[PDB]
Amino acid sequence: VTDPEALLLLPRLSIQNANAISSPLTWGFPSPGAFTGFVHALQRRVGISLDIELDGVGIVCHRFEAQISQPAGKRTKVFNLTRNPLNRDGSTAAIVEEGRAHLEVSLLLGVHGDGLDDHPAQEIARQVQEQAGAMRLAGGSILPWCNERFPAPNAELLMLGGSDEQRRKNQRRLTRRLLPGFALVSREALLQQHLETLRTTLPEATTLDALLDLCRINFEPWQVRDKPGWLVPIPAGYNALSPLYLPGEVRNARDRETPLRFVENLFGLGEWLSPHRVAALSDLLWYHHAEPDKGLYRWSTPRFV
Amino acid sequence: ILSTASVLAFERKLDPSDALMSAGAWAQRDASQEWPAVTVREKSVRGTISNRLKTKDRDPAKLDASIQSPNLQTVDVANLPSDADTLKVRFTLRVLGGAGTPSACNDAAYRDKLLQTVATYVNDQGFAELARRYAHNLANARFLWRNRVGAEAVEVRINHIRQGEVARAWRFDALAIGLRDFKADAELDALAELIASGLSGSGHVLLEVVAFARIGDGQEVFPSQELILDKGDKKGQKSKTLYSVRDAAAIHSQKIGNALRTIDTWYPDEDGLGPIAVEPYGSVTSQGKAYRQPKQKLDFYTLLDNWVLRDEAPAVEQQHYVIANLIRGGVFGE
Amino acid sequence: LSTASVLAFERKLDPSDALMSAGAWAQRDASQEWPAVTVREKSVRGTISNRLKTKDRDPAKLDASIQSPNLQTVDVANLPSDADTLKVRFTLRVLGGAGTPSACNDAAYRDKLLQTVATYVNDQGFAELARRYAHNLANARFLWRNRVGAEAVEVRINHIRQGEVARAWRFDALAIGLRDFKADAELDALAELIASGLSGSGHVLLEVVAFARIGDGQEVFPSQELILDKGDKKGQKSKTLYSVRDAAAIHSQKIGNALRTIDTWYPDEDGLGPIAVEPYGSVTSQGKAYRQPKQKLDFYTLLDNWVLRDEAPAVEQQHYVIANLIRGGVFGE
Amino acid sequence: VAQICDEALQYAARLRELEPGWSATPGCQLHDAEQLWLDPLRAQTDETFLQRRLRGDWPAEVGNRFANWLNRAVSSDSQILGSPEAAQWSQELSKELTMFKEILEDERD
16 A cells, blocks of 8 residues: 555566466456465565565556367357376376466566665566566466567666656656556446446345346347446455464464465456556556455555546 | 249340440541540549538538538549540440340240230331331430530441441431431431341341540540449548540440430320330439339330230330330349 | 429530640741640758747757758649740530529429529520620639739630631730620620520530740649548659649639639629639638528529529529529539 | 547557568558557668657657548537537547547657
């Protein structure tokens, strides 16, 4: 929530074999909670020898080539899978279905901390790239860079110093470094607008998540409902149900020094604007709030509209 | 009780080519084999809004927004060269023959009834009437649709190619011969004898027609006009296009074959208003008005489907009508 | 009673494309095979002269106005220095039978229009239209631009029906005023010829040869054709002079509007120079919309009153009505 | 209107930059409007005194041509041409043209 002093950048992170399931009822894009987890993992393997912190993250999704197929001319789409090794007897395995996709995306990081003037810009940008090049991203690997040679630099700026037109000049540098991308920010505004326009029947949010990503067809007062943007149902965090257990209580945990809670995951609503719609590029960050007692974990996009 | 077949179809007798225009000097018109053709080329036009604008919105703001920056477009125009003053139009017209015989049917009884009806006509009274009327429309400059209006001396030369040279050469004058009246000569009756001997199957006939129409020393001719789609495209594209051949201006074969079959002086509203284009529901397109209304019983379909099914004869004039639009062609039947 | 959906007429007073030739002295008694004025091209350095924004705070425009100029091609049809007479030669025919519509639809509207225009023609003749058309031919108003600054704009209109000349007309356009609706003797003989051609009692072929005396190689200005967004600056983007085969030329619709002034009762001031006849009488040469449909000087109001509603306008309004029933045009809804 | 104009600007920027080489050539009549806006960066072997033909080529010809193409294909109310909906649509078309010019006028700078 602290307003950043820098916008670190990693311009083309081509990833392979990403996890395009993301939820029990979406399938397209890897969840933005994975991206905030990646930024926090960069903060844990960079921001201990630099005295900074990393919270903001941008999403642009240059191209999205999935790995799908449709069966027998139907209008649904099954996932294609991977084989598995054999058992002790060597017959066949219990093949469980998991999706898979291919992406690239840039990350607009945000450096809140004070270690920006104790180091030059290219040094911190270069070592953040050298650490981000060796880290699994959302269940998938990050591809390195070959001899095409052009986006190999990794930019940065300084939000704390500058004028209004100079910040617009840095914005004109950045938004042309991201020309074909499509941003991603979540809307409570439009979703509460749809609650308080469908509110006569029932305030159930699931029927209006289902009735918003839709090519809806109505009658005379052919007609298809329109929209200025391109909308998506994305998971917007976690909605923990259990009382928080002490660390040694739960059997078979990951480690025995941090507590566990059992969770169903929430659902909100996200969209896809070009980066040239909204002006300030501190509006395209995924901070995530958390609270101990209330079992509500959330991946917001604050300060946006 | 017999019934008309579902699909009738008749071929096109009196088959014309396209007309190819050219332009040479008068009194050199006998040497008309080396004349340069009229070439369609472009020009520009700065227009002005000039149709009947709806006077439910007459604001000087939008009226002056029209008149300050008007529409502007490219229109192509065929003209004569500088030296030349004539207009050599040349096409060729062959006459097939066997007019009653269809090219499709769905019955044998109806087919032989129609053939014996047309043969009853031909043995009863020959093709000489429609032969003289087609001879008139070849004699005058009717195939010139607009180059005739505003001319000095339209000399028409109908030759007659049988083998690879001319057999008999005609030399007419399209303003001595009247446009609307239908009279005969010895020369026009020789031409009608040739056309009737063509249409009755008793020979072969290939008439090429060359008109020499003085207009002026560069005055603007009017070839046929193509069609272009333009729903308000960007940059202001074409609005008029002229039909062409391998670098020459031309007139459509359906336009020539519409001028030649202008026969009908028997449509029951008037006769002094001119002969009209022979069609079913016989309708001039230039007036938006269809003569021979099926209010009355002087259609083509009602006359054909009474004179073939029931042997009730129409008048001799309407027999000539029914056979003129059995000789233009056209798909019939439901 | 109402009009029809589509009315149309034809281009009576149909002119042609001009042939601007030139030549040496005293051969214009028998000027037959003189060379012509062509369309030849030459470069120009475009340094900007267009208006600029006030309070020019930025010296970037001070630099880039001159430091990066433009280079383009403008074609100029100068006469040869050995020649002085812009011989603008063209021809002009008159169909006649003006009130006969080219493509009407409604018979009753056609009947009232035929009898109303015939009432005009055999009541009050075409001599006023003939005198003003012979005046517009007598000067060089068909030359929209080349009249200004001349020695002797010497017209030679001739009448040809068969392959020979008839007589020799010899004029000026400085003795003949630009704006005078006078009545001379030989100009009314040629106007009587135009009256015979227009009213439908014969046929006429008028070729018009204006010896514009502009100078010993002085610049003249034929019409400019358009261009689209498929060509750059180099490649004659700015000006392209209209032409015929190795000669410059003048359009037909342009002369054919600059020979049809009858309307000198537009409301503002006829003393400010006459106009060109159109329905909704407008002059894009000055961009202003005279004859508003707000008023009753709209031609469509004039024709719908002189045919449909049976209320005849002033005689001068009727001269205007048949001026734009004789220029041609699309009409109807 | 402004949403479709901005989406078309972003898609045309992302799609016109497929090849890494292009300059003045035959058939480049779009290059008078899209030589810097609807086109990627050119080659790097010409003379160094050419940064003013693309750095100064703002979105007034290309963006103005896009606004004119939008106003020539799409239109407004013709019988209600004094009402406020056509005025809001004209202001939206002008704002879309100005936004496209401000977004694509820096194709050399």
